[PDB]
Design a protein around this ligand. Structure first.
Ligand SMILES: [Mg+2]
Ligand SMILES: [Mg+2]
Ligand SMILES: [Mg+2]
Ligand SMILES: [Mg+2]
Lengths: 195, 204, 196, 125, 222, 226, 212, 233, 195, 196
């Protein structure tokens, strides 16, 4: 699919993902949710080739849910991101690789810190204060480089995110039909239903 | 398209009097887009240091692979692996993927704990060893590094003098490469102390 | 094609097979590849039949106009006119021509003009797809100053072998003898040359 | 591979290896299940022959197969881990393909199927 | 298919001083892995206190230098023996290069001399004619090996004054002709060590108000 | 790369230059191209440098095990057969071009080997990008019944021709002499005709020249007691 | 490359970076990407360096001939159209240009035309061209007002190039600033990006992602 | 754009104390077929210049005709055609170099590599190269095609730099050239045994040697070579 | 450029054209007018390859203005459309053809009838009640086939046009930044400044 | 390559040139192309040197194992083993082999195995790039039941011509004679065969 953004503030991680699904000529849907909850305090958004995106995301979801049941314990965001990276690094030398890029937003309950990881389809992982995939970063990073502070509130993060989406809606040629925004903090994952 | 220059980056290593130095930039990118300024390319397993340039997914994969292998080595051998031995392990590991290789440019640096002798080595993506007395270079600005090192380097430099030489070699090479920069780290390595210094450089 | 020209004591003789080809189909089994550009200057053609017929027609025109102004042209002059057309139009032509002629001053002469458009004066020359198979035979059997009967035998035997091994060559062996006495046409049929 | 038929019929129509497996269950600590009007309770016996045990880390007798289904057992402890692992994997596989968690009857039918398979497969007890 | 272009290797270097300018280049000419000549001059005195080098495909290089030398000759004829200033020469070379925009001279051109105030000047061109006045410029095969070294040792890039720790830059003090030649020689000695197409000899042309002087130095022949 | 092999009276000599390249850039100025398959069987390699070194060590390893199994000193024909069959199998994809020389109980031997599996026998051979320069010298000065001193001289002269005339070759000459009934003598840097001249200037910096953001001690020691 | 130009109350701001690359190799950090067509007109360099240099100094010659013949300053509309009509003649042959022709006349006021090698000619208020154009657009779009002061507009242009220089690998070196008035353009200096980045980071509080 | 059809291989040359030497074999190849065995590829121009040509033979014959025409043209209205205003080696080369570069610039090259060898009016040795691309260069030794790879290394051992030229006699130089021709016959599959050699000296003038043969060849050692590895018989 | 629409009603012709101009990655402008007035009662909208569109349109404009001055007479819409078709039919067999598609909306003052002509870059002309170029017709023609009446008012035509643009904004992947709408009738050409 | 094998009264003789080539560079001027797969069964190799050496090594192994079990193999059997390898691996091989051998029951026999992997039993055979130029000469000059001296002359003269015209061929002419008397190696140098 198209645009996926992420920003880590003082006490939470915010992920924004577009709603459009386009089959070449027509926009088949304008309310698509490009995310999967891997565990109560870990969310993964995704974008890439059709079919492979959801297939990969649900495959990861199933594996983390299996770990959670087996150990009766939630893996740290760092541990989940490492598992995901290895799967993609394995995939890139396969017969037919997963063409999927992801952002992993999680709140580490042990360290009481939000964490944002950016991983591309090759298995290239980086921890960041803010990240994106595709062309999304080209439009938004200059705004984030200017305004971002590590001590921002969740409300300030949402406002900086609105400025980023406005710039995307102005300068991007494609109509991505807005974004679904989700917040990850100490209390879990929730969706902002008005954005 | 070329896997060895998608992400960018550089590593350089040098020898001095009873010491070695290894240094790298901090950039990770997606071609023209700068993605991270905290992507360190030097790792260590005991007292043996390994720098890796090239495709970033393979950099991460190989670090994890050599941590894996050196940990098993230590458990079985009951001692830390030495630079000379580790060099052979890197070569072996790379050649086993002869016809489906990791797109990387590794660099080894360290001091042999028994002889006290300074050691450096370099590799191509498929395992060939370059064991130079003076210096080793790797990455998207390897040409630039060869030019700096060849003129700036002299043998038997004291640790604090060697720091200045390798730092100036990296900095000025990186500034002539679009895909390198965004910070830099230098390791000065003596027989039983290692100092790590982050350098101030231009952020474009 | 299998074509050749051989100088001998009394002049020069040209020889050729009679097979014209489009793929594996023999489009003409009784072709005449020995072509007259002047009374006692003839040529052997190989390559594209369209190209070599066009060239030969132009040369015949050039030498007819030369003769009207300056008298009988030399064999060297005829070869030069062939070369000029083959060299200057090398990009667009596929032609390998052997020029043979009889002067009274220079006697029998042979010039070969390969693909590039270069000229080479030789005691004898061989060309065409079938010539590859008789380089060995011809080099071993050619002598200078042979008689007419010996030269006819040399060409008959040589082209017999070329025809035997080259599928592109075949039919009758045509020959044209160029001497002071005049111009003589010879033909030799399969039943004759196959039993050699 | 080892193919030996360990579970076979006897002249009186009994499969002794299956019947001896029941004797291992008889030896195991007692487990009980009771369902109320709006709940189910699983009770388990802990033999007090083992003190100086660390109860924080010692394997507990009741195991969650999913967030809504539990499994307790009597018999060989090591054997039960293999059935629990298989059941946990199948539970996640069912969620992945059907997009709905397992019914209690389905999960039971699966575990029972695994147990049956090990009574007419070569080389296994 | 016919390829009208080739690569003759070579490396050139131009540096502008306060009241002088140098244009240096190795004397080795190559194709593929063979040496054509160990001494084939590449930097030329073009008259009017201007030196020039067109590095890359030597046929195009020789053609361009030949046409510029010719342009100097005709500038004298057409404009009463007026001296062609370095800035005017540079603009003229742009038009020579852009004239073949759609079938370019496959060369990297550098000229050196003094400007109309007597100060050192170097100009640098791409194959199709874009140009810039510069203080320091290497061209050709080993350009990537030489330029970073010059950034550091001529412009004192990444060098700061001891004690201040990054707060005060090393001041850009002017270099003598003896000092520049030292840096040129070390640049080519280092390039010779690491680039296979660089070696044999180094020829330097120095331009001052007094005229054009030449210096030659041996390089390693392997 | 320039590598040669020359037979003489009572043995065989091989030689090589010491330059390894990545495209037009010299990666190492003092590379070691003379490889040991066994104590008295040495080979020199051109082509893909990892391949020549890997295939040498694999066959060298198997040759050592074979020597222990059979209680016999290894033969050159064994190394040759094992190298060619391995390389044929990989259809030239393993880019190893080798000159294999040595002495064994059968006598002294000299072979070369193409990457696709073909072998040849000779009294003098050359391989690599500088092989034509080397072969020119060999074809000009080789004779039957050369002495040890004459063969070393001829071999190093052939490498020099590669050093000076081939851009792919340079720096120093390495030699290895294998004489019948003697230890093989490896002469590393037998000739050193390419030492760099002293530079015009020292580039040692004043201390404190480089700007530093942060300093920290790196813990290379294991987890400590107490 | 990153080049921009925008219209405002006090005229036009033109800002460019200084870097030229051949693949990954940084050829120059001191490239002049603003072409001084004449004392009243400016053009920006993007795409082909030669194509932009050659044809925009040529444009300066055509503008000089126009004012000699017509005894009047050429309009930005007419100047831009001379260039666009010229490159349209060469369409297909492989010219590479993306430029902003900037000027300030009596009849038009401040005017900017984007001119392209495939023939495009667009009048507009804000244009941004190059490999780092998207980064500069972000800073421009969120801070642009018509009623900016000359001091604030000059900074906005400087800051937008810095944003691109930081993120875009092929942009950097130094920033060149120009302010175009009705009486001609005024040069506002060369600013090394290395020194500028640290200065802006401290004074502005931006780039918290970077350690200094 | 074309492809070469009938071709000629290496031309080799060097300077010595009093002049220059140049040599080339007498073969005209048609691919791998050694078709024409009496082709002269050294073409003298006057008594002070010899032009050696390799590559396409049809284009060589064209260049030969251009040089013949050049001599005719120079003699027109020129009383000093055999004295002060005779054709110099430097004049002949510059003309050819001009033609070669022009032809490559029209994408229709003369598919050749050419070496012009001669002695100037003042006694100075002239030796310069030009090819189908218009590329030119000078050196104490020059060679084309295979000669570049095999002859130059041997000839450079005699004259390594400029200062070695006065120390090199005509006997030593000719010996070196003849040896190089033997080496090329051993190792170039498109070479022949028969060759021509030309010496241009400032004292003794132009000496043109035809029908030379490669002699003193070593082949006897072949009898001991058996199989490709393990074969003994 | 992208979307151009046309509809002929009872007494006028209405042309709608998008405002976006996109240089690959970025939207350089969002207020572009893709039309030229050829004569007081004839308007031409255009779309195709960059540069060629404006160059062709202005070339046609210059020629019709030249005719108007020479004869002191306005050519009929039919005559103008025939001239334009011939220029494109000539262009298609040129060295480098004009890659331009046009709609010509005119009011014939002699017949007192509105007229709409659709011409593609090949020189294919058709007179229509409503027309489009590119993918625009694929989305809009089913709505026009249903609602169109020959006796519609200008206001009814604008309303049917709004329904067409709404469908385009819903199902098209590209953001064309709205449309500029112009009306051609007996009184000339005017722009609807609120749409 | 220029290779041939010829049966005669007392057995069979194999002949070959000694030139090995990588392009126009002669990588070996003293090559031995006559290869022993059994005591009195040899072969001539042409094509890829890697392929023909690999095949010949495998055949030598097969016949060594055949001999240990069933005694001396026939020449027909050796040809069949060559064919099996060449036919079944036709996609991946470039090999043209002539097999020649001497039995006491069958005397001298020659089998040629071209590219496809077909087998053809012949009185004599020619192969390699140089063979094209001597089809004419060999067909005219071959007789059955020649003497040893006549057969040596036939091969010497034939390969002389092949070498003369084929640039890929050259060096020394090697020969191996296979009779009841044993195995004899012959070598002929350029100064000898060039003057023929
Ligand atoms: Mg950089
Ligand atoms: Mg940058
Ligand atoms: Mg060098
Ligand atoms: Mg031959």
């Amino acid at each position: 699919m198209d645009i996926i953004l992420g920003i880590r503030v003082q006490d939470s991680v915010i992920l924004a993902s577009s709603k459009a699904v386009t089959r070449g000529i027509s926009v088949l849907k304008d309310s698509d949710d490009k995310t999967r909850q891997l565990s109560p305090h870990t969310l993964m958004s995704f974008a890439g080739e059709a079919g492979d995106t959801v297939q990969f995301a649900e495959y990861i979801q199933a594996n983390i849910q299996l770990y959670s049941i087996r150990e009766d314990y939630e893996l740290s965001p760092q541990a989940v991101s490492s598992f995901v990276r290895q799967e993609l690094a394995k995939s890139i030398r396969s017969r037919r690789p997963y063409q999927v890029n992801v952002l992993i937003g999680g709140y580490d309950k042990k360290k009481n810190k939000p964490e944002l990881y950016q991983i591309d389809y090759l298995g290239t992982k980086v921890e960041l204060p803010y990240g994106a995939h595709g062309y999304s970063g080209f439009y938004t990073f200059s705004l984030l480089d200017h305004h971002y502070r590590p001590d921002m509130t969740t409300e300030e993060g949402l406002d900086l995110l609105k400025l980023c989406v406005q710039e995307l809606e102005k300068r991007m040629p494609m109509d991505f039909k807005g974004v679904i925004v989700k917040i990850v903090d100490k209390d879990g994952i929730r969706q902002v239903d008005d954005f | 398209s070329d896997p060895s220059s998608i992400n960018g980056g550089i590593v350089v290593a040098m020898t001095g009097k009873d010491c070695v130095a290894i240094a790298c930039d901090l950039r990770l990118g997606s071609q023209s887009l700068g993605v991270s300024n905290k992507f360190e390319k030097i790792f260590h397993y005991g007292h043996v240091f390994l720098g890796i340039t090239g495709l970033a997914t393979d950099v991460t994969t190989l670090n994890e692979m050599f941590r894996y292998k050196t940990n098993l080595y230590k458990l079985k051998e009951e001692r830390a692996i030495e630079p000379e031995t580790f060099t052979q392990l890197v070569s072996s590991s790379l050649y086993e993927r002869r016809f489906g290789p990791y797109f990387v440019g590794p660099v080894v640096a360290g001091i042999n704990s028994k002889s006290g002798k300074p050691f450096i080595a370099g590799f191509d993506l498929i395992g060939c060893i370059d064991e130079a007395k003076d210096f080793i270079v790797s990455g998207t600005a390897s040409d630039q590094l060869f030019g700096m090192c060849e003129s700036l380097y002299e043998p038997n430099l004291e640790p604090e003098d060697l720091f200045e030489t390798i730092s100036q070699a990296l900095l000025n090479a990186a500034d002539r490469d679009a895909l390198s920069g965004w910070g830099a780290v230098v390791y000065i390595i003596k027989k039983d102390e290692v100092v790590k210094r982050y350098l101030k450089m231009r952020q474009d | 094609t299998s074509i050749m020209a051989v100088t001998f004591k009394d002049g020069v003789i040209l020889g050729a097979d009679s097979r014209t080809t489009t793929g594996a189909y023999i489009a003409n089994r009784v072709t005449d590849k020995l072509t007259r550009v002047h009374d006692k200057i003839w040529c052997c053609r190989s390559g594209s039949a369209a190209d070599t017929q066009a060239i030969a027609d132009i040369v015949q025109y050039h030498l007819e106009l030369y003769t009207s102004q300056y008298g009988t042209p030399s064999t060297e002059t005829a070869a030069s006119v062939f070369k000029e057309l083959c060299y200057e139009n090398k990009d667009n032509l596929t032609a390998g021509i052997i020029v043979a002629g009889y002067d009274d001053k220079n006697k029998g002469e042979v010039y070969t003009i390969p693909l590039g458009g270069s000229v080479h004066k030789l005691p004898y020359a061989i060309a065409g797809s079938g010539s590859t198979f008789i380089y060995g035979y011809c080099d071993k059997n050619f002598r200078e100053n042979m008689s007419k009967e010996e030269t006819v035998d040399f060409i008959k035997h040589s082209l017999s072998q070329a025809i035997k091994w080259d599928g592109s060559s075949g039919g009758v062996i045509r020959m044209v003898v160029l001497t002071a006495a005049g111009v003589e046409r010879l033909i030799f049929y399969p039943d004759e040359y196959e039993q050699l | 591979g080892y193919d030996r038929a360990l579970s076979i019929f006897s002249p009186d129509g009994h499969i002794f290896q299956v019947e001896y497996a029941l004797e291992a269950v008889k030896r195991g600590t007692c487990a009980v299940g009771v369902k109320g009007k709006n709940c189910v309770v699983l009770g388990c016996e802990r033999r007090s022959t083992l003190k100086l045990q660390d109860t924080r880390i010692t394997p507990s007798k009741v195991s969650k197969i999913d967030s809504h289904v539990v499994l307790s057992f009597s018999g060989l402890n090591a054997d039960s881990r293999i059935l629990i692992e298989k059941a946990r994997v199948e539970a996640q596989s069912h969620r992945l393909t059907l997009e709905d968690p397992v019914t209690v009857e389905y999960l039971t039918r699966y575990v029972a199927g695994v147990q049956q398979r090990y009574t007419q497969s070569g080389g296994v007890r | 298919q016919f390829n009208p272009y080739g690569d003759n290797g070579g490396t050139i270097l131009g540096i502008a001083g306060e009241d002088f300018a140098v244009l240096a280049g190795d004397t080795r000419n190559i194709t593929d892995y063979s040496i054509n000549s160990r001494y084939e001059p590449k930097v030329f005195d073009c008259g009017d206190n201007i030196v020039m080098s067109a590095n890359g495909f030597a046929a195009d290089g020789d053609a361009l230098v030949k046409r510029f030398k010719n342009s100097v000759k005709w500038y004298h004829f057409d404009h009463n023996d007026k001296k062609l200033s370095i800035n005017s020469a540079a603009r003229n070379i742009q038009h020579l290069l852009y004239g073949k925009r759609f079938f370019p001279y496959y060369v990297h051109t550098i000229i050196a001399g003094l400007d109309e105030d007597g100060k050192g000047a170097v100009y640098s061109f791409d194959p199709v004619g874009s140009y810039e006045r510069e203080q320091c410029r290497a061209g050709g095969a080993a350009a990537s090996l030489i330029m970073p070294f010059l950034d550091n040792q001529v412009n004192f890039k990444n060098q700061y004054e001891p004690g201040t720790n990054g707060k005060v830059k090393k001041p850009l003090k002017y270099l003598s002709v003896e000092e520049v030649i030292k840096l040129v020689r070390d640049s080519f000695t280092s390039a010779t060590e690491r680039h296979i197409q660089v070696g044999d000899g180094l020829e330097i042309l120095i331009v001052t108000k007094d005229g054009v002087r030449k210096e030659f130095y041996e390089l390693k022949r392997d | 790369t320039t590598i040669v092999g020359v037979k003489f009276n009572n043995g065989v000599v091989i030689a090589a230059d010491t330059r390894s390249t990545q495209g037009p850039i010299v990666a190492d100025k003092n590379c070691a191209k003379l490889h040991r398959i066994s104590p008295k069987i040495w080979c020199a390699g051109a082509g893909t440098a990892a391949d020549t070194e890997a295939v040498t060590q694999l066959i060298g390893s198997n040759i050592e095990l074979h020597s222990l199994y059979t209680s016999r000193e290894p033969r050159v024909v064994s190394a040759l057969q094992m190298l060619k069959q391995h390389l044929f199998k990989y259809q030239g994809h393993i880019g190893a071009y080798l000159i294999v020389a040595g002495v064994d109980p059968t006598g002294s031997h000299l072979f070369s080997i193409h990457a696709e599996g073909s072998t040849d026998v000779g009294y003098y051979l050359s391989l690599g990008s500088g092989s034509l320069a080397a072969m020119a010298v060999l074809e000009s000065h080789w004779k039957q019944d050369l002495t040890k001193e004459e063969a070393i001289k001829l071999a190093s002269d052939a490498i020099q021709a590669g050093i000076w005339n081939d851009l792919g070759s340079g720096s120093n000459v390495d030699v290895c002499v294998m004489e019948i009934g003697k230890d093989a003598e490896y002469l590393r840097n037998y000739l050193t005709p390419n030492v760099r001249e002293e530079k015009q200037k020292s580039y040692k910096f004043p201390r404190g020249t480089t700007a530093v953001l942060k300093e920290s001690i790196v813990n290379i020691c294991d987890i400590q007691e107490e | 490359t990153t080049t921009l130009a925008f219209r405002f109350q006090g005229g036009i701001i033109v800002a460019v970076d200084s870097r030229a690359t051949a693949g990954n190799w940084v050829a120059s950090q001191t490239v002049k990407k603003v072409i001084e067509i004449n004392p009243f007109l400016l053009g920006t360099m993007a795409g082909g360096a030669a194509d932009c240099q050659f044809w925009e100094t040529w444009l300066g010659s055509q503008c000089r001939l126009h004012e000699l013949r017509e005894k009047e300053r050429i309009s930005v509309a007419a100047a831009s159209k001379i260039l666009s009509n010229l490159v349209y003649q060469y369409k297909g042959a492989g010219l590479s240009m993306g430029t902003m022709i900037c000027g300030y006349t009596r009849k038009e006021g401040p005017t900017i035309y984007y001119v392209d090698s495939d023939g495009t000619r667009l009048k507009g208020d804000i244009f941004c061209v190059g490999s780092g154009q998207t980064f500069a657009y972000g800073v421009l779009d969120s801070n642009y007002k018509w009623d900016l002061s000359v001091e604030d507009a000059l900074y906005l242009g400087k800051r937008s190039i810095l944003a691109a220089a930081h993120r875009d690998a092929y942009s950097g070196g130094s920033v060149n600033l120009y302010h175009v008035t009705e009486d001609g353009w005024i040069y506002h200096g060369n600013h090394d990006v290395g020194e500028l980045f640290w200065k802006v980071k401290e004074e502005e509080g931006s780039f918290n992602n970077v350690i200094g | 754009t074309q492809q070469p059809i009938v071709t000629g291989t290496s031309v080799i040359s060097m300077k010595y104390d009093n002049g220059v030497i140049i040599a080339a074999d007498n073969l005209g190849s048609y691919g791998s077929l050694l078709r024409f065995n009496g082709v002269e590829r050294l073409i003298p121009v006057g008594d002070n210049t010899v032009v050696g040509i390799s590559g396409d033979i049809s284009d060589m014959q064209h260049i030969e005709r251009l040089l013949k025409d050049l001599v005719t043209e120079n003699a027109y209205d020129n009383p000093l055609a055999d004295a002060e205003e005779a054709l110099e080696p430097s004049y002949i080369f510059e003309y050819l170099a001009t033609v070669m570069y022009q032809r490559r610039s029209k994408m229709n090259p003369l598919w050749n590599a050419i070496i012009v060898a001669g002695v100037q009016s003042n006694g100075d040795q002239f030796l310069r190269y030009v090819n189908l691309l218009g590329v030119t260069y000078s050196s104490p030794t020059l060679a084309t095609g295979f000669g570049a790879h095999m002859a130059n290394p041997l000839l450079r051992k005699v004259v390594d730099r400029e200062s070695d030229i006065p120390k090199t006699t005509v006997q030593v130089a000719e010996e070196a050239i003849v040896n190089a021709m033997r080496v090329l016959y051993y190792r170039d599959a498109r070479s022949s045994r028969n060759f021509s050699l030309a010496i241009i000296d400032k004292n003794t003038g132009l000496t043109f040697k035809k029908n030379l043969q490669v002699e003193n060849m070593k082949w006897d050692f072949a009898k001991d070579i058996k199989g490709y590895g393990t074969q003994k018989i």
